[PDB]
Design a protein around this ligand. Structure first.
Ligand SMILES: [Cl-]
Ligand SMILES: [Zn+2]
Ligand SMILES: [Zn+2]
Lengths: 21, 30, 28, 21, 30, 21, 28, 21, 30, 21, 28, 21
């Protein structure tokens, strides 16, 4: 879950790259 | 890269920036 | 014309009108 | 795609909604 | 359309997007 | 009041269209 | 040139400098 | 209007303040 | 000018807008 | 401190101009 | 081309990737 | 500067990181 990982928890560059295509 | 809570359109624009020409998916739902 | 500047507004405009449905963003 | 349609001319919410999931 | 609290410049940009060439008014004061 | 309807309360597409010209 | 992209920055720039006064936005 | 003035050349806060209420 | 809390990228864009061609510095750290 | 002056406290136009170059 | 519109995205893109380091913005 | 490089062609995070402090 993206909101869950980055909005209500904090997430590093490597964690936002999991949402790339 | 910043160390903060990214939400709404701030989180999408971060995606847009870090995925580059790969593009990305945004599925916010629970 | 200038897709990178245009792209950044698009993605904001999809986030508003897709809401809970979300979207895929593929510049191709 | 949406870039070649919504970057040249402008799209409305309704054309824009075509790209949603 | 999203189901969220729209404030500051997020609310204005939502307006800009949904009113199109009609344009809009923004009068925030109490 | 716009702030009142959409910032401290939530408002649908039809409610933001009341602020168009 | 490209009013839709330009418009989106303008309206953000008016929201900052008009504050409590608000503004009208009419592209005409 | 403000589009034809602030989209070509750049405006400052003070030209920009002309459009406020 | 608005009377609000300016944070994250909202504060930077306010800077960008008010400093004009002078440009500006952004040093958020404690 | 900029965050300190404008993010967790409020700051007027004259206070953001201190951060210009 | 249009530095004022471009500038506004740049500065947002630096705020994300510089984080705690911050940056200077000098259009020159 | 960064304007003349990142406004013409696009820059990545890594070119972009050159401008950080
Ligand atoms: Cl733009
Ligand atoms: Zn925001
Ligand atoms: Zn733009």
């Amino acid at each position: 879950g993206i909101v869950e990982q980055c909005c209500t928890s904090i997430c590093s560059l490597y964690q936002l790259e999991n949402y790339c295509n | 890269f910043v160390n903060q809570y990214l939400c709404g359109s701030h989180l999408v624009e971060a995606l847009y920036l870090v995925c580059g020409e790969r593009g990305f998916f945004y599925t916010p739902k629970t």
